[PDB]
Structures are given as C-alpha cells and as structure tokens.
Ligand binder design. Structure first.
Ligand SMILES: C[C@H](O)[C@H](O)[C@@H](O)[C@@H](O)C=O
Ligand SMILES: C[C@H](O)[C@H](O)[C@@H](O)[C@@H](O)C=O
Ligand SMILES: C[C@H](O)[C@H](O)[C@@H](O)[C@@H](O)C=O
Ligand SMILES: C[C@H](O)[C@H](O)[C@@H](O)[C@@H](O)C=O
Ligand SMILES: [Mn+2]
Ligand SMILES: [Mn+2]
Ligand SMILES: [Mn+2]
Ligand SMILES: [Mn+2]
Ligand SMILES: [Zn+2]
Ligand SMILES: [Zn+2]
Ligand SMILES: [Zn+2]
Ligand SMILES: [Zn+2]
Lengths: 416, 416, 416, 416
C-alpha cells in the first residue's frame, strides 16, 4: 500500500520527464547478474577446501558459517537468491566440481558438474565457468599458463581446454551460453628482467587453449587482465594491454574487473572503447579498497558508472554482468545479497535515466543542462521503483531481508 | 500535493527507523553553506578583472555571461540564492573590494567592503573572507608569504594583516564571525633543492600575520594546505603536514580542501583526526577531476562521506562548510546552484541516518548489519524530505530551477 | 686523460662481469632519439605563432628567448644538437610548415616542408611528423577527428591524410621512414552521457585517414592515447584501450607516452605486452608531475625502466624513441639537452646490463641474486663509459655544456 | 689498486666541484642505519614464533633458512653486518624478548633483553625498540590502544609503558638513546560509522602511555602513522593527521614510513615540513609496491630524495634512520644487505652533492642551471667513493658479497 502509493507518485514523476517506470522494470528483467560461487566458501572449492587460498588473492575476515560442500553452498546460494530480485546466474570455478574421487585438473569433465547443472535447471539459472589456475602445487611458482616448464605449462593448457568443454556442456544443457573466463595469477613479486618471454608463452598457450572450436551458442571464451596481486606486485604477465591485444586479435570476449586497475582507473570508461573491438565483454564488478581487496559492491559512483554505460549503450547482448568479490569478514549470504542488489539498483537507475534527452543536450553543447539534469536525476524517486521491482519478485524491498539472513544464520550457519 | 503525499510516506518510513524528518529539516537549517564568490566572474575580481588568473589555479570553459562588477555579481548571487534552500553565506576574496580608485593590497580597509556588508545584511547572509595572494605582480615569482625578498614578503604580510581587519569588521557587523582563510600559491614547478627555507619563512610570516589579537566572536583564522598547482607541481611550501603543524601549534582553524590532496586521498577521513587538535575546521568541498580541477560538487561518494562526518560528530559549531570550485564551461549560476544544493542534499542525508543505531552495531562488531544498513539507507525516500525542505524555503524542489536560470540568462546574461 | 683513465678502469670493470663497453658504445649509436621541435617555440608553430596553445596541453614558465621562426628554431636546434652525443631525429608538427602564404591544414604539401627536409639532409637527421589537430578554430569545440559535424570532421580527416603524404615525402627523401603520430585532444571536461559515438566516429575517421597505402619504407602511422587533459578531465575519446584495439586491429604503430597514463602507471611495463600485437612502437618519454605536465626527462627510475625494456628486448628496429615534453620555465635549449642526454644515459646503462646473466638467474628462480645484481649494477662505473661516448662524439662530457648554452643565450637569445 | 686509482680520479673530479670525498666519507660514518630485526625470522618473534603474522602486515615468499631463535637471529644479523659498511643499529620488537618462561606483554622488563644489550655492546651497536601490538589474542579484534574495552585497552597501554622502560634501559646501557616507536594496526576493513571515538581513545591512551618521564638522553618516543593495511583497508585510527597533530602537540618524535602513504605520496617532502614542529624524526625507509608491500629498499628516486633531504638539512641529530620492510621471498640476509647498503649509498650521494652552490642557484632563480646540475650530478663518479667506503670498512665493494651470503646459506641456512 505505502509502496503502492509511493509507486504511483513515482510513476507519475518519471512519466513527467519521459520516463516509463514499467518499461524500466521490464528491461531490468533482461539484465541478469552472475553471482560468483566462491564468495560462499572462501574460494575453498571442493577439491581440497582447507588448503590455503593462493594466487595473490586473499580472504580477510574469518567470519563463521562458510559453506563446506556443494550442498551447503547450494543452500546458501538459494537463500541469497530469495532475497535478490530478478534474474541471476551462477558463476562457477572448476574447483567446485563434485566427484567422489579426486580429479586431476587437467582431466575434469562435464560429468563432474552435473549436479550444478541439474540444480541450475531447477532454479532457472544460467551458468558461467572458470578454469582454476591457482591454489595448486603446480601453480606454486607463481606461473601457470606462462610457466617456462613445458610440462607445467601443458597441464594448465589442458585444464583450460577441459574447462571449455564443461562450459560448452553448460550452455548445451541450459540453453544459454556459459561465459568461461580465463584468469591466471602469473607474475613476479619483484623487479623483473624478462617481462617478454612469459608473455610470449602465455600468448601461445592461450591460442592453444582456444584452438578447439565450440558452439558460440553454448560457449564464450573471456580473458581477464590484472594489475598486480599480493606476492606478485611488480609484474603481471596478463596485463591490460596484453589482453586487450589478445581479445582484439583472437576475438574472444574481454573481461574487465573493476578492482584490477590503477589508482583512479575505471572500467566504466573502458566499456565503450573496448566494445569497438571485441565481440563481448564480461564485466566483474568488485570494490577495491586501496588494493584488489575484493570488497562488496556498493551502490556507489563507479558501480553506477558502470551500469550507465551498459545501459546507455544498449549492451544487453554483448555484456555479461558478474560479481567478483569475496569478503569473509561478514555474513557471506549478506555479502552476496548486498552486492547483487546493489548492482541491480545501479542498473535500474541507469534504466531510469532520460538518456536520449541527455544525449541530445550533450550533442548541442548544453553542458549546463546536462550536468544539471544528470544531478537532478539523483533526487528523483527511483527507490519507489526499485521497491516495486522487489515486491513484484517477492523480495524484501528493504532492510527486512536482513532478518531472513539473521534467521538462517541462527538456524543453520550457527551449526557449521 | 504529490510532494505532500510523498512527504507523508517518507515521514512514516523514516519514523519507522527512528528518524524524525521534521527534526532533520530543522537541523539542516543549522548548516549554512558559504558560497564562494569567485565562481561568478572567474576569479577575476574587481581590482583588475581582465588580467590573467594565476597561482596554479585555472578557469576552463569560456562560457558567456560572467559578472563584470559587484553589481552583476550580487545580482547573479541573488538569482542563485533564490534557487538554493536554507542558510548560506558569502565567501569573499580581497580582490572583490569596491573602491573608486585603486588600492594597494597591503592597504585595504573595511570601508572597501561596505557594500558587500550592507548587502549581506539585507540578505541575511554571513560573510567570510580571504586575502588574495595571487594574480599579482608581487606573486609572479611564485612566492608571496614565503618570498625570500623581505620586502615582497612584507607586502604579503601586510595584505594578510589588513585582511584580518576586514574580516573582523564583517564579524562585527554581521554578528557572525568571519572565517578568514589563508591560501598562497607558493611552491616550485620542478626539482627543488631547498624545501626548508621557504617553509621557515612561511611559518614566521604566519605568526606575524596573526599576531594582532582580534575578537574570536568576529573573526577566525584558517590555513589551507595544497598538494600542487599547475606550474608549481613539484613542491608546495604550505603543504598538508606544514599547516597541520601550524594549526595545531598556533591554534588556528585548519582548512581542508577536497581537491588539494593525493590521488584517492579524502578529507572526509581527516575531519575526526584534525578536530582532536585544532579548534576549528574550514571545509572546502570541491571535485578534483585528475588534478585540482575545481569542478562542481556532485552528490557523490566523497561529498556524502564529508557530510556524514560533520553530522555524525555533531560538528555544527566547529565546522565551517564552504565551496571551492570554479567551472567556467557552463552557466555560472547553475554551477553554484548545483553544487550548493548537492552539499545540502548530502548533509540532509546525513541528518537522516540512524547513526546511534549504526554506531551501536559497529561497536558490537555487527559489521554485517552495519554494512547492510548503511547500504539500505540509500534506498530510503530521502528525496521526499529534501523536496519538502525546498518547498518550505520556497525553492523549486526539482529540475524546474533550470528554467529560471535559463530565463535569467536570456534576459540578462545574454546582454553581457 | 682523466676521462681516458677512468674509461680504462671502467673498461676493465665491466669486462670482468662480461660487459663490453666498446660494444655498448656501438650499440648506443644505433638508437636515435627523435627530438620534438615544439620545445623551441612553445608549440607556437609558424601558422599563427602567438595564438593560444590549446588542446588541454599547456605551456608554463614564460622564460625568455623562444624561437620565433624556422630560422631561429633551426639555430636553436643546432646548438642543442652540438651538445647531445650520437644519433638524433627531428620530430615535426604540421604547424611548423614554411610557406609565404597561409595554407589550410587540410591542404598542406610536401613542399611546405622542403627546407626542413634540406636541413635534415644537411644535418644527417631523420625526420618524424605529426598532424596538428589543435590550436585552431575547428578544434575549438574540443573535437576534431571525432567531431560530430561532418564537415569539421572531414577537415581533420583531410589534414591527416595530407600529413601522411608529407611524412612519406620525408621518408623518401631522407631514406629513413618518418613515423607519423596521431594525437587529438578530443574529449570532455565533465560528466559525459555518450562516450561511445565519438569513439565510433574516431574509429571510422582513422580508417579513412589511413586508407591510402604508402610505402612502409618511408612512412609509418602511429596512434597515441591519453588519459586526460586540462579542460577535458573527464573523458578522452582516444583512450588507451581505444588505440590499443585500433593499433592492434589495423596494424598501425602504437605510441606510448610516459606522461599519459594514471598515477603510478608506467609504459615501461606496456612495451613487452604491446609488441606482441602491434608491429611498431613509438615511445614518447616525458615526465608527468601530478598531471601530464610535460616536464623534462630525468635520469630516473621510469626513464631507465623504459630504456631497459627496449634494450632487453632488442627492439632496435620496432621502437622509435622520442621526446614529448615542454618546459617553458627554463632555457629551452637546455631543456632539450638535459632530456636528450638523459634518455641516452638511460640507454647506455641498459646497454651495460649483463642481461643474459640476469635473465639466466631469473629463469632459475634466483631472485636473491637477481635483485642483488640489478642493484649492484648501479654502482658500476657507467659514468665513465658515458663520458667517453660524449668525447667520441665531440660533446661535453659534463656540466660544461651549460656554458655553451649560457653563451648562446647571451649572444642570441638575449636579443629575441 | 684499480679502486685506489678510481678513487683518486673521483677525488679530483669531486674536488673540482668543491666536494671533498674524504670529508664525505667521514660524514657518512655519522649516519647509522637501524636494521630491523624482524626481517630475519619473518616477524615471528620469540614469544610464539610460529603463530600467524597479524596487523594488516604480511610476509610473502616462504624462502627457507629463516632464523628460529635469538641465537640464529644474531648470527644472521652478524653475517649481514659484515657485509654492510659503517655504522648500524638494531631495531627491536618487544616479541624478540628472551625469557625461559612466558611473559605477559604487559609485564616485560629490561631484564628480558639483557642478551640483546650485551650483544649490542659487543658489536658496537645502538638499539631501538618497539612495543608489539599485533599478532596477539588481545589484538584480534583489530584494536589495541584504541580498543573500546577498557581492560584490553589497559593491557596495551601497560605494554607500551613497560616497553618505554626497556627502551630507556637500552639508552642507559648503550650510551645512545633508543628510539621507541609506536605503531598499532587499529583500523577497519570496511565502511565505518565512527572514526572519532577510537581516535579519542587513542589520544588518551598515548598520553597515558607517555606520562612517565624518562631521560631523553636514553629514550625517545616516536608515533607512526599508516594509511591502510590488509583487512583494515578503510580506516586507520592512527592516521597521518592524527600523529602529526599528536607529535606536534605532545612533542614526541614523528615516524614517517615511506610505504605508509597514498599513491605518489612521498615522505621526502614531509621531512622539512615536520621538522618545523616536532622535535625529532624517525624515518622508515621501505618500498611499497602497489600497497604497503614492504619490499627491500632500492637505490631509487625516493630513497635518494629522502637521503638528500636529511643531508641538505643537516639533520644528523634530529633524524633517526631505519629500515621498515620484510621480504621473505629471498635470502633474508641479502634482503638486509641490499636495503642497508642502498640506504647508505643514497646518503653518500647526498653527501657528495654541491648543495650550497645548488642552493645558491635556486635562490637566484637559475632553474636552468639547477636542473642541469642536479642531473649532471648523476654522472659524477660517486661509485668510486662508495667503493672506497666499503673497502675502508672491510666490506666488499661489489657483488662479491653475494658469495658470502651464498656460502653462509650452504653451511648454515641449509640446515634450518
Ligand atoms: C577467484 C577469482 O577468479 C579471481 O579474483 C580473479 O577473477 C581475479 O579477479 C583475481 O584477482
Ligand atoms: C581561489 C581559491 O582561494 C583557490 O582555489 C584556493 O582556495 C585553492 O584551492 C587554490 O588552488
Ligand atoms: C603537442 C604534442 O603533440 C602533444 O603533447 C601530444 O603529442 C600529447 O602528448 C598531448 O599532450
Ligand atoms: C612490524 C612493523 O613494526 C610494521 O611494519 C610497522 O612499523 C608499520 O610499518 C606497519 O606496516
Ligand atoms: Mn579481484
Ligand atoms: Mn582548489
Ligand atoms: Mn603529454
Ligand atoms: Mn610497511
Ligand atoms: Zn575478476
Ligand atoms: Zn580551497
Ligand atoms: Zn606524446
Ligand atoms: Zn614503519
């Protein structure tokens, strides 16, 4: 009722500036967010859960209740899912495989992910994938796909090749292509002599990894740059330019992670440049706090900036929105909830923007009006629209979702 | 009525989280925003209006309609003010003096600002002040208060001392202390051999500058650090530590400017630290875009963080909120309008935060709850309260204010 | 003799670590540095010299004696050149053409550069070139090649196409391909609604611009990204990713400018990545001080890192090294001299590095030894080798060159 | 002989510029470097060596041969020391205490460091100290001195109070005041509501901590700011402005750590500013690679700028020079060796600078000459001077020191 009313006023407000709230809602329904599985168990995986997170990535917090297997994970995920409106996907790491016996990374098969697949069907989720190139003895030296050792190198190439197959299976089975992201930790902590060679090896390996042609309808390859990681601060083989080059040249999708750049550097600006040259873009929304810290996505300037770009450019088909963060210092379900909802809220507000009007003002050099209007947009009643969206999707419109979280914690997590 | 309706709903939603919108509105009225006069004529001043803006500060845009004198300036200020709700002050620079004949800077008098004073009275505005230590032949070497030349030095000293008197005069007349900010461009463009001497001169100069005791009820001294300027990139005499030591040791107020720090550096963090050692703070809100660009303040992450800090700590008395930006690329009046409204919006929002609750959660280590709630606060109907605030002050609640600016521009600005 | 002695000692020291100083000297002779002409007259050019430097690029200092025509510029250049050992090139801007009557930018011709060419021949200098897309009426809106106006856009397109021909002309005549760099200021000061369209337009334009096939032996196209400029802080059409994609996909050269990235971002790291995708690199060495301030190049960490990368990779052929800075606050000749020699000193040091050994240690995981060695390199007697370099090229080995500059200043610059 | 010869040449060259190399050598011996003990055992300490390094501080590498006790530590220190020329000191942490039985941190005594002292006596070293406020159950919440719980708070206060007594004990016994630095990890990983209260508590605590007047001839109190740490990214109680204010207000010494600031921020600039307010400076030399990474100090731009400042200002008495870094990815002895020598190399180069002349050029506005000379200074034969310094101190002049380290590694480290 209050919502209802609030909704009506909003409807009218927006109408007056040429904005159709309904349509906005429809459109928001066309923008799924792929939730990252790893937020649930601290990137532990099911290969060897308790066995140090590596790659220059880190888990800070030790809050209790982490999931410890597929089952807990799925349960945790559903809980989160019920408190997040609209479309979602699940982004999986190869270490999240389910097998009675241990599987060599270079040997995974679709079969190791059937449960995930059946579950996804049941939950009306699309699935995404990622070879796991870290937290492994063969990753110990800080090199994987660029490793100078042929054999090591081969093992990683093989794992990647296999991963493409699982991914393709996901798309076959789900009817929506699985975006399979390649991220590797390869780099050097200190002053490096030869930055080239590794880059050369990485180039060759990737080409081999994507050599097998797969159905685009079921599978997409993406490469993700990174500036630096803890323990590999001075050099990253797979740098921004390297992958920009790579994706452009081999026509794979390019993954842009909001926490993987320089200080003050923003992927929102990159979206429009990159799409002129690469087929698709996988966007990893994450909050870096003075480093690639992986904090939870907030409804902030850059998250909003990113949404705007996607929406202004009508990137519904070519962009894949994913979360990329891991905060172990708080409730993990809450983490996914806050994150996802935030992304959606940024999206919605972008959908509520009178872009054409603004675009038109800009074209005319009416900078005064553009700024002004861009700013006014912030005090328009979008919240009302967001809450109607929640309501429609049977999701708590406000802070009440916290009680559910609290409740599940008490009831479940508390026992883990 | 829609407003009224929206207001009522909000009133209720907030109340449900323990927030009283009516009190909020009242509190907002206790937070004036000191608008910088220099935004109206591109820091031209009236001494010698057309005569290059110096000091490492720039004016970009050349948009038409700039004020050309006190009269235009006041008119322009008036338009702006009618479009901005609640309390405001006028922050004046010494070069805005009004004299039939030329006045040496080191000789200005209270009488050179009587009109400004009268006007202020009439408009119920408090006045703040600043000595002008740039765009002057004796500032051309890039040194003023720290100039090795005793005589040049003296001159600036004197100008400063005289400015304290003008400021005190304002306080006396207006019944509200004038905060007199001291900013100098002093620094070097390139690799510097001696960073010490200039700082030594600066320190001594300052002490001299403030040696005359004035009524604290009418006048406050503030000092403003700065990281770098165009043309003085390598070193700034009046650095952050410099003024922090100064203000702490001499007990003056400290001026913190949102555009005068390192990349990713934020004054919002600094507020709670500095208030433990300095009597008062002068806050310069500004948006630096890649440098001390002086862009209009937006309702953004930092402007909000700033507001929150002031409000959380109940800094009503010890904080002086001011704007410090200059964008000549768009309508000047709009520039002021957007920025002032934005500051006020941020403050309002801070006033609507359930801090005590939050504070309590944080103290108990409930970081899940704190984050979640901080975030949910962004989808609370604050805009309705803001709009009511506008209404109550007879100010447009939405974008309509542009029309006004537009019309003033046609009728007025168009003829300049 | 002292030099001789020091040299001999050095010769032996280096020999002992497997380094041949003689060979390094020879190598150094294979690495010209392209001097930027614009440092001589404050990017004034000869179209309309006194007529505001625009493009978000600035000239700070106002030191006296700037060159006022091609004659003075050449004289100044020669003086500089006699103080810089080894190979050099001259990098010209379109606005430095020499014509009795005005020439529309869109109609320049080889013939407008004949004297530069004859001079170059006589001075044994290769020539480089650049279209001048700024400081012009049709660049006044901040857009050139991405301008939405078809005709303006065409104009800049034409001007670039015409510049290619001048460029080829240089390569024909001099027998060394002229690298023709493309840099445009296009961007926005403030928050932008559409970053895509301008990139789209830029993309198409460049394509048209390079459509004419010219002889590689005489001509090379290069594109240069930029992060931001004064008066275009928020967005730059031709971003890093933009050109990275561009160069990669159209196989043009990619220009990496040391002052054009984010804080802490270094192109030295980008060299080995870009060369895997682009056929050539044009490197602009510059010292950005908190902004693309264009300070003189120092023998500093980053200039050395760039040097090392080129040398380590044996990029003698694919890399074009040039200067890109402008300091008008000191003697301009000295500016050139300092920067040029510094780049050469950085090169020589790189050439005196026992790379193989190091490379070898790194590949074995001997990071201890690597770090140790790299650092000890710094206290080896490279100064001696540099000084002998100077001597063999009949150039002052030390600070004495300043006398020369001072002398020219007195005799010539003093009367400008 | 070759050294002697190079030495003589250098001698002459520097004299020609008014620099006396013998005097330099002498002044260099007046500038000890305080080696941090913790690099040798990865901050393990002796309370509970194997028991996770906390505080937002990390140890990356796991290279073998870390010291396991005081004995190992001392032996390792000695090996390092024989490879580092001229004066050094040892900086101790409270966790390196030697006791048969466990000692609550709140009750340590001078007697728990007796061996250290006797060893220092025998090795002619001065000693520095630090309370350890991390890697402890009572520091698990991320708060220590700012902890809201009175008792926890009380424990850390007492620990600091007792550490002061140990420190004074060092001063007494050694005849040189021990500088006792106070660093705590206290901060928040995420968005914080109340930054004020912890600061107020910290303030009050520090005042209590230093309430006991000790003999300045034996002891000095220093406070160390920090910007952020892993797991405490968002807020740090003891910020730059907090400690600048504190040190200025209580007249303690101020610790500036080169890895503890914002990107591009440098302490070299801060020295001259701070010195005007605080009695003494504690300077931590460290290399932050994209974060407070704690990499080994290189002879780099900033290390050199710090040295230059100390020396230019004749800060021999008021500044205490120490190392603050921890790299566990390479041989720990070498880490110390590299960093220490690098710091000494930078100081020596500063000592060889013709400051007065340069100062004099600068004061006259001869910026051309200043830059030119500053830069020419880099090609002067400082290496020979350094190498003589090494020889006079019975230390390897070059890279040969690695063989000693390698040898120790084989004989001793290999068996740990
Ligand atoms: C676990 C995850 O794939 C990882 O974070 C990568 O995506 C990359 O962002 C690393 O910093
Ligand atoms: C004109 C005005 O005082 C000025 O901008 C200062 O406050 C400081 O920001 C200067 O760069
Ligand atoms: C004038 C000169 O070409 C210019 O500097 C561009 O190349 C680019 O560096 C912009 O600053
Ligand atoms: C362990 C050591 O004291 C520590 O490094 C502190 O001094 C501070 O620099 C934190 O990073
Ligand atoms: Mn990440
Ligand atoms: Mn400013
Ligand atoms: Mn530049
Ligand atoms: Mn540190
Ligand atoms: Zn990612
Ligand atoms: Zn300011
Ligand atoms: Zn350039
Ligand atoms: Zn430190």
């Amino acid at each position: 009722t209050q919502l209802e009313q609030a909704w009506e006023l909003a409807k009218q407000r927006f109408a007056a500036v040429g904005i159709d709230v309904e349509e906005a809602l429809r459109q928001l329904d066309r923008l799924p967010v792929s939730m990252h599985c790893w937020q649930g168990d601290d990137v532990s995986g099911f290969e060897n859960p308790e066995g140090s997170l590596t790659g220059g990535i880190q888990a800070t917090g030790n809050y209790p209740g982490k999931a410890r297997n597929a089952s807990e994970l799925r349960a945790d995920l559903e809980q989160a899912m019920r408190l997040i409106p609209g479309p979602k996907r699940l982004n999986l790491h190869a270490i999240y495989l389910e097998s009675d016996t241990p599987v060599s990374r270079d040997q995974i098969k679709p079969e190791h992910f059937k449960n995930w697949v059946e579950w996804a069907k049941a939950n009306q989720l699309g699935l995404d994938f990622n070879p796991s190139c870290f937290s492994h003895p063969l990753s110990a030296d800080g090199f994987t796909l660029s490793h100078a050792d042929d054999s090591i190198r081969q093992f990683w190439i093989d794992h990647c090749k296999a991963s493409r197959r699982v991914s393709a299976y996901f798309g076959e089975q789900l009817g929506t292509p699985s975006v399979m992201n390649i991220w590797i930790p390869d780099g050097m902590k200190d002053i490096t002599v030869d930055r080239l060679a590794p880059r050369q090896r990485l180039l060759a390996a990737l080409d081999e990894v994507i050599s097998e042609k797969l159905n685009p309808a079921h599978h997409i390859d993406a490469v993700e740059s990174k500036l630096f990681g803890i323990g590999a601060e001075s050099y990253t083989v797979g740098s921004n330019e390297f992958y920009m080059g790579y994706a452009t040249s081999r026509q794979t999708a390019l993954c842009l992670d909001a926490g993987h750049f320089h200080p003050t550097e923003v992927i929102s600006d990159k979206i429009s440049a990159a799409m002129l040259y690469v087929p698709q873009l996988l966007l990893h929304v994450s909050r870096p706090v003075r480093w690639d810290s992986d904090h939870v996505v907030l409804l902030d300037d850059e998250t909003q900036a990113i949404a705007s770009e996607i929406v202004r450019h009508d990137l519904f088909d070519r962009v894949h929105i994913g979360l990329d963060f891991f905060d172990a210092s708080i409730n993990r379900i809450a983490a996914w909830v806050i994150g996802t909802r935030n992304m959606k809220k940024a999206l919605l507000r972008a959908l509520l923007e009178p872009t054409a009007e603004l675009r038109k003002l800009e074209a005319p050099g009416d900078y005064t009006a553009r700024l002004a209007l861009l700013e006014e947009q912030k005090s328009l009643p979008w919240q009302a629209v967001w809450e109607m969206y929640c309501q429609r999707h049977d999701t708590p419109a406000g802070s009440e979702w916290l009680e559910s979280v609290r409740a599940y914690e008490k009831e479940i997590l508390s026992r883990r």
